[PDB]
C-alpha cells in the first residue's frame, strides 16, 4: 500500500527521510563542525561501514585493539541519526574530541553548512545503482522504521523515482561527483575497493596525510576484509537488538560482492532500469 | 526434501520421467491400437497443445464453432497417456470414440505407441522456445495436482535443464521430433510462428489435413482460436476442472512469446543460455 509506504517517511528539503530524524532536523542543520572534522558521505548501502573502518584504522595507526574499544556506530557517529531514548548523532559528535569522523548519507546540498564553511575533508563512496538497490531492499526488510518495500520490482520502481530514504541515488551521486572534482573531497568507488583494495587503501592514507607503511596497509587489508568485518561484533551491527535490526532475516554484512544485481533483476527489469539509468546519467562524466 | 517429493511424484518409463499415475498402467498405452485416420498432436508440456488442438478441431468441423463446443476440449480430444485409476483414462476415451480421432500426447517419439507408426498416422508436432516453456511449466507444477513443490524458479529451471521433470528432457524431445519431422506425414510447427503469422500456419495446417482453404474458414479459425477468445471459452480454458485437479485461482495465462524475460534473472539466463548451446549446437533446429 502506498499510503502505508510513505507513512514511515517525511520529506525534508525535498528528499524523503525517516520520520524520527526529521523530528530533530533543526539540530542537524545547526550542527557545529570543526576544521579537522572528516566526513564520510554515502548513499545508503554503498559500503559506508567498510570505508569507515578503513579510515578509523588509519587514524589509530592500524591498532585493532583500539578499533574494538567500542562499536562502529559509536566510534563514528551517524550525523543526522536520532531516535528518542536510543541514539543521538549530533550529541555524540558534540561530546567527541577531535579529530572527529562523521558518517552521513546526506546529499551535498543538505550537508550542514558548517562543514562547507570550515572546508572540511570529505570522503564520498559510490556504488553501482543496481547493487545498491538490492542491498537497500534488504535493509528495508531488516531495519525497523521501514514500510514493506513491496516486491523487488516494486521497490526498484521506488528506487528509480527516488521515492526512498535520502532521495534519488542519481541526483546524490551526480552532485557529489561535482563536489569530488575538488581535491578536498575524495570520490571513491565500492567496485575499486573490491578490485584492488591495496590501491584504494594507499590512496586513503595519502588523502589523510598519513605515512603508508607496509605494516599499516597489511593490517588494514586484513582487518577490513568482508570475512573479518562480518564476524567482528564491533562492525557487523550485531550488538543492536532485533527490534532495531533483525539480522536473522538477513545479515547486515550480507554478501559483500559486486554484481549481486544479476541474481535479482529479471531481464525485463534490467532492461527497464538500464534505459532509465541512461536518461538520468548520460550527461554526467561519472562512469563505472 | 525436494528430491524426496520428486521421488514420490514421478517415476521413469523407458528412461523418461513420468507422472506416477500414468506409469501404473503404461501397458495400456504401450498396446494402444491406432486407426489409420488417427491424427496425433504431440507436444512437450506447455508448448501450446491446446491452441493447435482447437485449430485442428475447427478444420475437422469445417469451422463450425458450435460443433467445437459440444463438449470440453479434453473430452473432444483425448489425452492419450492420461490415467488416474478409473477417474481419468485417455485410452478408454479413445477406444470408445467413433472416429476420426484427434489424439493429444506429450510423449517423445520413442514412447509413442508402435501402432501409430505402424499405421503411418499423420502427426502434428508443436514446439515452443525452451525458456517460455520453462516459465509455463513452472506454473503448471504449482496449479495442477500430482506435482512436487517446484521450489523457486531458479531451482525449477535447474531440474528443467537436467530433464528432471515429467516427459523428460525438452532438449531431447524437440530434437527427436525434429528428425521425425523430416517425414512428410509429421508436420513440425513452432508456437512462435503461430504468434507471428497465424494465417500462414492455419493455411499450412488446412493443406496438411487435406481440406479446402477458404477465406471464411480461415477467418473463423483465426478469431475463434485467438488467445482472448480461447481464454474466455469454457470449452478450452480448462475451467470445468475442479480446483482439486487444476487450481486456476489461469491455464490460459498470458499467451505471448518472451514471458521468460519476466522470470529469468540475468544470472539464470546466462547459465541457461550456456547450457542450451551445449545441448542444441549439434541440431539444425532453430527457434
Ligand atoms: N569489508 C567489506 N567488504 C565488502 N563489502 C562490504 C564490507 N563492509 C560492508 N560491505 C557491504 O556494504 C553494504 C552495507 O553498506 P553500508 O555500510 O553503507 O550500510 S549503511 O547505509 O551504512 O547502513 C553491504 O552490501 P551487500 O552485501 O551487497 O548487502 C555489505 O556487505
Ligand atoms: N490461442 C492461444 N494463443 C496463444 N497462446 C495460447 C493459446 N492457447 C493456449 N496458449 C498457451 O499455451 C500454453 C499452455 O500450453 P499447453 O496447451 O500445451 O498445455 S498442456 O501441456 O496441454 O497442459 C499457455 O502458455 P502461457 O500463457 O505462456 O502459460 C497458454 O496461454
Q: Numbering strands along the chain, what is their spatial order in the largest sheet of chain A?
A: 6-3-7-8
Overall morphology of chain A: globular
- Hetero groups: 3'-phosphate-adenosine-5'-phosphate sulfate
Helical residues, percent of chain A = 40-55%
SS class of chain A:
alpha/beta
H-E string of chain A: HEEHHEHHHEEHEHEHHHEHHHHH
Task: Quickly list its features.
homodimer, 288 residues, alpha/beta, Rossmann fold, 4-stranded parallel β-sheet, two-stranded antiparallel sheet, 16 helices, 8 strands, binds 3'-phosphate-adenosine-5'-phosphate sulfate
Characterization of this structure:
The structure is a homodimer. By secondary structure, chain A is an alpha/beta fold. Chain A has a single domain, classed as Rossmann fold (3-Layer(aba) Sandwich), CATH 3.40.50.300. Helix content of chain A is 45%, strand content 11%. Chain A is built from 16 helices and eight strands. In chain A, strands 6-3-7-8 form a four-stranded parallel β-sheet, sandwiched between helices. The longest helix of chain A is centred in the C-terminal third of the chain and has 15 residues. The first copy, chain A, is globular. The interface between A and B is small, with 10 and 10 residues. The structure holds 3'-phosphate-adenosine-5'-phosphate sulfate (2 copies). The site of one 3'-phosphate-adenosine-5'-phosphate sulfate has 19 residues of chain A, from α4, α9 and α15. One 3'-phosphate-adenosine-5'-phosphate sulfate (PPS) binds next to α4, α8 and α14 of chain B.
Amino acid at each position: 500500500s502506498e499510503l502505508d509506504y510513505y507513512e514511515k517517511f517525511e520529506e525534508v528539503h525535498g528528499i524523503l527521510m525517516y520520520k524520527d530524524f526529521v523530528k530533530y532536523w533543526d539540530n542537524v542543520e545547526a550542527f557545529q563542525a570543526r576544521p579537522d572534522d572528516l566526513v564520510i558521505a554515502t548513499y545508503p548501502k554503498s559500503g559506508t561501514t567498510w570505508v569507515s573502518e578503513i579510515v578509523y584504522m588509519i587514524y589509530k595507526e592500524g591498532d585493532v585493539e583500539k578499533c574494538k574499544e567500542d562499536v562502529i556506530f559509536n566510534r563514528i557517529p551517524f550525523l543526522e541519526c536520532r531516535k528518542e531514548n536510543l541514539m543521538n548523532g549530533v550529541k555524540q559528535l558534540d561530546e567527541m574530541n577531535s579529530p572527529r569522523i562523521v558518517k552521513t548519507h546526506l546529499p551535498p546540498e543538505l550537508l550542514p553548512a558548517s562543514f562547507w564553511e570550515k572546508d572540511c575533508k570529505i570522503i564520498y563512496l559510490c556504488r553501482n545503482a543496481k547493487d545498491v538497490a538490492v542491498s537497500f531492499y534488504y535493509f528495508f526488510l531488516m531495519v525497523a522504521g521501514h514500510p514493506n518495500p513491496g516486491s523487488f520490482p516494486e521497490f526498484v520502481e521506488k528506487f528509480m523515482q527516488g521515492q526512498v530514504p535520502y532521495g534519488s541515488w542519481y541526483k546524490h551521486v551526480k552532485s557529489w561527483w561535482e563536489k569530488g572534482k575538488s581535491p578536498r573531497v575524495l570520490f571513491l568507488f565500492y567496485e575499486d575497493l573490491k578490485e584492488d583494495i591495496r590501491k584504494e587503501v594507499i590512496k586513503l592514507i595519502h588523502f589523510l596525510e598519513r605515512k603508508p607503511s607496509e605494516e599499516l596497509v597489511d593490517r588494514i587489508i586484513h582487518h577490513t576484509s568482508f570475512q573479518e568485518m562480518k564476524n567482528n561484533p564491533s562492525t557487523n551491527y550485531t550488538t543492536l537488538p532485533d527490534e532495531i535490526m533483525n539480522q536473522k532475516l538477513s545479515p547486515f554484512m550480507r554478501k559483500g560482492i559486486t554484481g549481486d544485481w544479476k541474481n535479482h533483476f529479471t531481464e525485463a527489469l534490467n532492461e527497464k532500469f538500464d534505459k532509465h539509468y541512461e536518461q538520468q546519467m548520460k550527461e554526467s562524466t561519472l562512469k563505472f
